[PDB]
Amino acid sequence: DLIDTTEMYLRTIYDLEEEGVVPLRARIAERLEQSGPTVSATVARMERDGLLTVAEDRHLELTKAGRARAISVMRKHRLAERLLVDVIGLEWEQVHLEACRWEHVMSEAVERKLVKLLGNPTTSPYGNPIPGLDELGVSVEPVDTDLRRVDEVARSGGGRALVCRIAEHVQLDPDLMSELKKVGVVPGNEIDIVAVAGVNKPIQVQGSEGGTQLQPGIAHAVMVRVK
Amino acid sequence: DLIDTTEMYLRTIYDLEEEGVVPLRARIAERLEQSGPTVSATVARMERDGLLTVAEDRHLELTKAGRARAISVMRKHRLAERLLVDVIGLEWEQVHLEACRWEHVMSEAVERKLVKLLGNPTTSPYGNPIPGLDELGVSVEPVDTDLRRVDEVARSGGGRALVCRIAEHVQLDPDLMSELKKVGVVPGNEIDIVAVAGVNKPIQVQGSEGGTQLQPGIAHAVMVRVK
Amino acid sequence: GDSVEPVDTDLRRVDEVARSGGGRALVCRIAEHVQLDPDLMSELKKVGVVPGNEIDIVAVAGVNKPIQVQGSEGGTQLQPGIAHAVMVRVK
Amino acid sequence: GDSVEPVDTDLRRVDEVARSGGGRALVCRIAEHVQLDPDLMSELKKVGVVPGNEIDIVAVAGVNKPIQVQGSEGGTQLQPGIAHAVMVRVK
Amino acid sequence: DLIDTTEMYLRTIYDLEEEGVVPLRARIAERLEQSGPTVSATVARMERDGLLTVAEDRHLELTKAGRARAISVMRKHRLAERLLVDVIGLEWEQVHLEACRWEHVMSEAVERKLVKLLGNPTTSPYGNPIPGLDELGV
Amino acid sequence: DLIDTTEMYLRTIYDLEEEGVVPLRARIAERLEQSGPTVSATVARMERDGLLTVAEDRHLELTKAGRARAISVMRKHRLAERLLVDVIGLEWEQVHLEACRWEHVMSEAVERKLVKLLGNPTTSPYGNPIPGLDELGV
DNA sequence: CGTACTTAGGTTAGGCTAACCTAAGTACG
DNA sequence: CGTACTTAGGTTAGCCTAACCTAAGTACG
Ligand SMILES: [Co+2]
Ligand SMILES: [Co+2]
Ligand SMILES: [Co+2]
Ligand SMILES: [Co+2]
Ligand SMILES: [Co+2]
Ligand SMILES: [Co+2]
Ligand SMILES: [Co+2]
Ligand SMILES: [Co+2]
């Protein structure tokens, strides 16, 4: 269950923008595991309500209102994640799924109280920046042009790099997130990315406590700063 | 399976008009065993295509095109029924269900050939008049103001009457049609309608080979000429 | 089910106490019904009707009549439905 | 399944007969493929290519070459896919 | 248009077998005038429902259930054709297209009545044998 | 608005039992501000799903499963209230409305973490006992 | 004669499969 | 180097339940 269909469509489009993926309805269908017809009908309903527009090349464009609402949901999501990790102490691999429900029920009133409690946090526990803090009534924005995707680093000849962001896409698989934590592919840990040739090949990575394989779509969603 | 959704919605509206019932979407939901939302969406699609309009009092009104198409389907239905009974010799109780599928696949070309084969028939084997014979390029129309509904005859004090029409609604239940045939409630047979008081009471009828009970909605659909 | 049938049998509803001739009692529970109205909950806090505060319930006669209660920081009127939904222990 | 593999082994395809050096043969089957074109079926009737009519098949060479056949009421040209889809018994 | 997609795919595969043609998806695309993607998707759906299998050489093989259904449709088709020609008197060239729609709506009940009416016919008006008369009990 | 219709109907019936009120459909209509027809239809749907039964005197009786689910929701509600007051510091009057939404999204996993964080609380900030702590393993 | 509920006929949101399409690929003698 | 097919992203028609509504009834101390 999505709890709120509209908010999840908005946040999924936001996720795709952060992963540098073209936000198509095909992407929402696979991500939220819904049929093509369902997604088109729901997007048409959101278009009617003025939260997005379907371009000629068919990529989904958030309106002013759509982006505002998407940011609001993502802000609630990553504040929830912060609360769940830092205060409540919920296990690292279970936090996202919990936060993915909580994002739909949290008031701005609570958000403002969480900002104070958590000491004005700027990133989620997975290194993703918290947007729309201006709208709450709360900093210098990190230059994140230096960040490169693990897949692109691997195809460019690999090397050593610091793990900075694990995108929402990766967080959806708890079993994988447990594997990443064990071997030590977590924010603020150094990893060695093995060189591969040709797109859509599984990337080998070596953490502090062993190594593992990432799928092309997973490696694309993990961002690092190469040493 | 309806075979053709549009044609069956049209013919169901036509059926309701012949039964002197207010053609509401609620009636189509019952008859075709479909959900309220399904019927509203399908009717909206037919309204868009200009086959009917939803009035303020919410009763369905066929357009010129809608009525023309409804007649076309009903004509095919009752010509099929004639063919199935008079030529093929399919059992009286099974014919309607067969004809309800055939009505969607028959060309005007075949209709014209059936008219010649069946000797320009004007009524179905269940006494219902065959419309739209003018549109095939084929008679004085029976004055059927003298016809009265078995339920209304029963509430008005009953009496002896000749069975003239069994509507499509009644034909949908083969087991009932077998019961009607056995006791002898068929077109061109005399029956005695027992007097009842109040609406929604089951009407008792006495045929040549015994008697049976009709539900209010069934009795409403059987038409007779009182002696 | 302490929540439905209290373990502390001496727990009594505000209206029941008032109709039984008022008294000094410690606020114990404020049911979810009462919580639904914030403006009321602001008032209840302001006059000191909160769990673990001693209050004085004004004796009352007739159902469908509001119940007067005195807290540490003043008094206020409860509706019959509201007073029914507040439990206390008389001292 | 007489329909797929004929019980009458002597049943042969018009094109196969033509490429095998023509012959006088009785029309036996006209497959559903042929039936799809009415204008063609009109022509087939007109010239007397119908089941239970003797026809003469003109010997032909090379596939993708149309097959000439002579019926009681004249002759006509079949396409390879059409001639393949007509079965006959050679006299 | 086709009335029943599944039944028409089955009968088209049956047609190709009768014509001694290799039943590929490419053949169905031509015959039914549908796109390659449409045919592959519909064949995959029929494979999933256990009406056929795609072989190694990629020719379509009807299952026991698929063949039983294909025969059923073809039987209805050719009995309809017989009725349309012998009884109704529809023109020889128009009969197939009519029968191609009727094949999807005819009950076995009517088939058994048509067998009696038409005097146990074994071939269509175009000389094509009527299969699955065994399965009617005639 | 309600987030979860079923859970809110269950908790509303639970609320009425705690208040010593007869849980009728009329009470749910008032409390949740829904029409009589809406409540009857939704209660019929919950009866069908085996979460309650309508008695002879027409008071709503939670089934084994219904009560278990109602407790689960109320437990989440009052643990949320504790967290919101003691830890987050949301204003006393706004907490319930927040907790009324949070009760529908909280996992048992989080409940167990809140039990430890809040030092095994037995009552909400409004003095209402927290039920079903047994079912958490506390 | 209100209080509680049913009957009757809607509605939108949010899901689904079947069955059609194009445009631009891959695989193979 | 065409023939057969896949990959990718759409579409409309035709079905569903859940969950809300009003207007006008019935049933009962
Ligand atoms: Co997350
Ligand atoms: Co979410
Ligand atoms: Co009929
Ligand atoms: Co029909
Ligand atoms: Co044919
Ligand atoms: Co067909
Ligand atoms: Co509360
Ligand atoms: Co709630």
Residue numbers in the entry:
A (entry chain C), B (entry chain B): 3 to 140, 143 to 231
C (entry chain aa), D (entry chain dd): 141 to 231
E (entry chain A), F (entry chain D): 3 to 140
Q: Which of the paper's sentences describe this entry?
A:
To clarify the relevance of the base interactions with the recognition helix of IdeR, we generated two IdeR variants, IdeRQ43A and IdeRP39G, that should disrupt base interactions while not affecting backbone interactions. When testing the affinity of IdeRQ43A for the consensus sequence with EMSA, we did not observe any significant differences compared to IdeRWT (apparent KD ∼65 nM), demonstrating that the hydrogen bonds between Gln43 and the DNA bases are not important for the recognition of the DNA target. To discard the possibility that other residues have taken the role of Gln43 in this IdeR variant and established new hydrogen bonds, we obtained the crystal structure of DNA-bound IdeRQ43A. The structure is essentially identical to that of the IdeRWT-DNA complexes, despite the loss of both the direct hydrogen bond between Gln43 and the first cytosine of each CCTAA repeat as well as the water-mediated hydrogen bond with the second cytosine. It is unclear if the water molecule bound to the second cytosine is lost due to the mutation or not observed as a result of the lower resolution of this structure, but it is clearly present in one of the four IdeRQ43A subunits. No additional interactions were observed in the crystal structure of this complex, corroborating that the base contacts of Gln43 in the recognition helix of IdeR are not required for correct target recognition and binding. However, we note that no loss of cooperativity is observed for IdeRQ43A, thus ruling out that this residue is responsible for cooperative DNA binding.
